[PDB]
Design a protein around this ligand. Structure first.
Ligand code: RCM
Length: 253
C-alpha cells in the first residue's frame, strides 16, 4: 500500500525539480514536487515492486503541495557514476547491463512501457547496483499533467502520432549500452537538433569506433541489433537476457 505523507514528517529539502529529503523516521528519500484520480495513479505505481525498480514509497497530497516520494540511491544516475573516475571494470558494467534488462522485463510484464529510458533514469547505489526510475513522469498520465532525444527510437522522432511500443524501450537500451562503454553521451559532433533528428531517422547511430575502452565484439553486435530501424527486427528484453546472461556468466562472472 501507498503511504500518505505530510510535509511536516520532513526536516528539510535540497534540490538535486527532484530533491533529497530527510524523513523524521524512515531516513533519506527522494522527493519530486484532479485531486482524486492522482492518488489512484499513485496506488497503481506503488504496485511496481522489484529489486531493479525505484519504488514509490509515498505521496504528499496537501493544500498547495503535491509530491511523489521515492527510495534514494546514494550514488546518483548512471552517467554521473560513469564519468566520476572511469575505473568501472568490465564485470561491473556487465552486471549493470543485466540489472537494466531485468528491470525492463519486469516493467513490461506489469504492462508499463517506460518511453524515457536513459542513463539519467538509471540510478546507482553504493555497491554499484542499479534501479530504473521515471523522474520525468513519462509513464504517468495524471501526475505528469500537473540531449533528451539521444535515446529516442527513430519512429518517434518528428512523429508524435506513433504509439510507443515495448520495442521503443529496446532502442533506448541499445543507446544506453553504448553510453555505458563510452563513458559519455552519444553524438558529440552533432551541430543542430534538426540535423541530428534527420541523420538518426536516415540510419545514423552512435559511433561504435568511438569506444576507446575495450567493449567485447558480442556486446557491439547486441547494441547494433537493438538499435535496428525496424522495431520488428529488435529483440525483446527476455530475448536479450537469453543471449546476454550466458555471455556474462562465462566471460564476465
Ligand atoms: C517517479 N517514480 C519512480 O521513479 N519510481 C516510482 C515508481 C515508478 C513509476 N513508474 C516507473 C517507471 Cl516507468 C520505472 C521505474 C519506476 C517507476 C515513481 O513514482
Amino acid at each position: 500500500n501507498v503511504i500518505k505523507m505530510k510535509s511536516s514528517d520532513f526536516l528539510e529539502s535540497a534540490e538535486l525539480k527532484v530533491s533529497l529529503a530527510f524523513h523524521r523516521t524512515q531516513g533519506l528519500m527522494i522527493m519530486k514536487t484532479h485531486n482524486e484520480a492522482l492518488l489512484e495513479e499513485a496506488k497503481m505505481m506503488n504496485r511496481l515492486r522489484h529489486s531493479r525498480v525505484v519504488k514509490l514509497l509515498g505521496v504528499i497530497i496537501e493544500e498547495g503541495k503535491y509530491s511523489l516520494v521515492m527510495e534514494y540511491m546514494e550514488k546518483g544516475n548512471l552517467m554521473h557514476v560513469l564519468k566520476a573516475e572511469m575505473s568501472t571494470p568490465l564485470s561491473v558494467k556487465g552486471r549493470i547491463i543485466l540489472e537494466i534488462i531485468e528491470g525492463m522485463a519486469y516493467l513490461h510484464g506489469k504492462g508499463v512501457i517506460h518511453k524515457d529510458l536513459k542513463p539519467e533514469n538509471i540510478l546507482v547505489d553504493n555497491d554499484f547496483h542499479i534501479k530504473i526510475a521515471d523522474l520525468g513522469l513519462a509513464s504517468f498520465k495524471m501526475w505528469s499533467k500537473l540531449g533528451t532525444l539521444y535515446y529516442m527510437a527513430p519512429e518517434h522522432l518528428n512523429d508524435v502520432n506513433a504509439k510507443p511500443t515495448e520495442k521503443s524501450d529496446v532502442y533506448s537500451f541499445a543507446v544506453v549500452l553504448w553510453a555505458i562503454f563510452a563513458n559519455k553521451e552519444p553524438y558529440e559532433n552533432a551541430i543542430a537538433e534538426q540535423q541530428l533528428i534527420m541523420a538518426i531517422k536516415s540510419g545514423n547511430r552512435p559511433d561504435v569506433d568511438d569506444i576507446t575502452e575495450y567493449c567485447p565484439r558480442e556486446i557491439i553486435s547486441l547494441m547494433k541489433l537493438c538499435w535496428e530501424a525496424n522495431p520488428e527486427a529488435r529483440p525483446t528484453f527476455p530475448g536479450i537476457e537469453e543471449k546476454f546472461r550466458p555471455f556474462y556468466l562465462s566471460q564476465l562472472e
